[PDB]
Enzyme design. Structure first.
Site, PDB file in Angstrom:
ATOM      1  NE  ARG A 213     -27.363  -8.451  22.791  1.00 57.87           N
ATOM      2  CZ  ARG A 213     -26.592  -9.497  23.118  1.00 57.87           C
ATOM      3  NH1 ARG A 213     -26.564 -10.613  22.383  1.00 57.87           N
ATOM      4  NH2 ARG A 213     -25.818  -9.417  24.200  1.00 57.87           N
TER       5      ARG A 213
ATOM      6  CG  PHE B 266     -27.619  -2.663  28.071  1.00 58.78           C
ATOM      7  CD1 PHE B 266     -27.202  -1.327  28.021  1.00 58.78           C
ATOM      8  CD2 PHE B 266     -27.097  -3.552  27.131  1.00 58.78           C
ATOM      9  CE1 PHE B 266     -26.304  -0.886  27.015  1.00 58.78           C
ATOM     10  CE2 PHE B 266     -26.206  -3.112  26.137  1.00 58.78           C
ATOM     11  CZ  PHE B 266     -25.815  -1.786  26.083  1.00 58.78           C
TER      12      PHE B 266
ATOM     13  CD  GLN C 157     -29.704  -4.947  18.681  1.00 62.23           C
ATOM     14  OE1 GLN C 157     -28.967  -5.044  19.676  1.00 62.23           O
ATOM     15  NE2 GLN C 157     -29.300  -5.258  17.449  1.00 62.23           N
TER      16      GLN C 157
ATOM     17  CG  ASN D 266     -23.560   1.366  15.232  1.00 57.25           C
ATOM     18  OD1 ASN D 266     -22.550   0.774  15.632  1.00 57.25           O
ATOM     19  ND2 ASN D 266     -23.965   2.534  15.739  1.00 57.25           N
TER      20      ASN D 266
ATOM     21  CG  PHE E 258     -30.311   0.305  21.217  1.00 55.91           C
ATOM     22  CD1 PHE E 258     -30.109   0.865  22.488  1.00 55.91           C
ATOM     23  CD2 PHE E 258     -29.514   0.712  20.165  1.00 55.91           C
ATOM     24  CE1 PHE E 258     -29.095   1.855  22.703  1.00 55.91           C
ATOM     25  CE2 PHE E 258     -28.504   1.683  20.359  1.00 55.91           C
ATOM     26  CZ  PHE E 258     -28.294   2.251  21.641  1.00 55.91           C
TER      27      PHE E 258
ATOM     28  CG  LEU F 188     -24.616   2.508  24.680  1.00 51.22           C
ATOM     29  CD1 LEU F 188     -26.017   1.962  24.440  1.00 51.22           C
ATOM     30  CD2 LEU F 188     -23.536   1.553  24.175  1.00 51.22           C
TER      31      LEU F 188
ATOM     32  CG  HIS G 283     -24.936   2.886  19.565  1.00 55.19           C
ATOM     33  ND1 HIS G 283     -25.141   1.877  18.662  1.00 55.19           N
ATOM     34  CD2 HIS G 283     -23.994   2.430  20.426  1.00 55.19           C
ATOM     35  CE1 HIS G 283     -24.369   0.848  18.958  1.00 55.19           C
ATOM     36  NE2 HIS G 283     -23.660   1.155  20.019  1.00 55.19           N
TER      37      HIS G 283
END
Length: 173
Positions: free
Chosen positions: A61, A66, A69, A108, A119, A128, A132
Site C-alpha cells: 500500500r 502520506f 506500507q 494495525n 509503514f 496517527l 500507531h
C-alpha cells in the site's frame, strides 16, 4: 540501537537500500519484532505457518503525501502477517510523535493488534499519534522511499509495479 536494512526492487529492478535505526530504548518489544522479521531468525509464524521474514515481502500500500506500507508476508495485501510472539502484541509506546517523513511505525487493525505490518511516513502525520507506535526512522535511502511513494497504484492503493524487499537483515556494527 539496532540498525536494519531493506534492499528494494521495483518490478524486479534494484531501486537501492533503505536503512533504519530502531528506537529500542523506547519500544524494545516492537523493535525486537521488526529486527527479527528482517533477519528471519525466529522461523515460522505460529498462526500463518509462513516464515517470520520480510524477504520477498511487498510494499502493498502506497499513498502519495502520506505513507508507504508493507510487511504482510503471508498475504501481500494487508490481510495477513503476524508478530514474532504468535499473533499480535500490545501498543508499547506513544512517546515518539508522527511529526516528520521517514518515521517507521506499526500499521494495525485497531488497539493492540501489532503484527508484522509497518509503514514509513512521507509527511508529518500527527493524527496517527496514539493509534500507531512509532519505533524507528530511516537513516539512509530516503530517495528510495520517495521512489516507492511515487508508484502508480490500483483501486486499493497497491502499486501496479511490484515493490519488493529482495533482501533484508540487520547491520551488525
Amino acid at each position: 540501537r539496532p540498525r536494519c536494512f531493506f534492499d528494494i526492487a521495483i518490478n524486479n529492478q534494484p531501486a537501492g537500500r533503505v536503512v533504519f535505526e530502531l528506537f529500542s530504548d523506547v519500544c524494545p518489544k516492537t523493535c525486537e519484532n521488526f529486527r527479527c522479521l528482517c533477519t528471519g531468525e525466529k522461523g515460522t509464524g505460529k498462526s500463518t505457518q509462513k516464515p517470520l521474514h520480510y524477504k520477498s515481502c511487498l510494499f502493498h500500500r502506497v499513498v502519495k503525501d502520506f505513507m508507504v506500507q508493507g510487511g504482510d508476508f503471508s498475504e501481500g495485501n494487508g490481510r495477513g502477517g503476524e508478530s514474532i510472539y504468535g499473533g499480535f502484541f500490545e501498543d508499547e509506546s506513544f512517546a515518539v510523535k508522527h511529526n516528520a517523513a521517514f518515521l517507521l511505525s506499526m500499521a494495525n487493525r485497531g488497539k493492540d493488534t501489532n503484527g508484522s505490518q509497518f509503514f514509513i511516513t512521507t509527511k508529518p502525520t500527527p493524527h496517527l499519534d496514539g493509534h500507531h507506535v512509532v519505533f524507528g526512522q530511516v537513516i539512509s535511502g530516503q530517495e528510495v522511499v520517495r521512489e516507492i511513494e511515487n508508484q502508480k497504484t490500483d483501486a486499493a492503493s497497491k502499486p501496479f509495479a511490484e515493490v519488493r524487499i529482495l533482501s533484508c537483515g540487520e547491520l551488525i556494527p
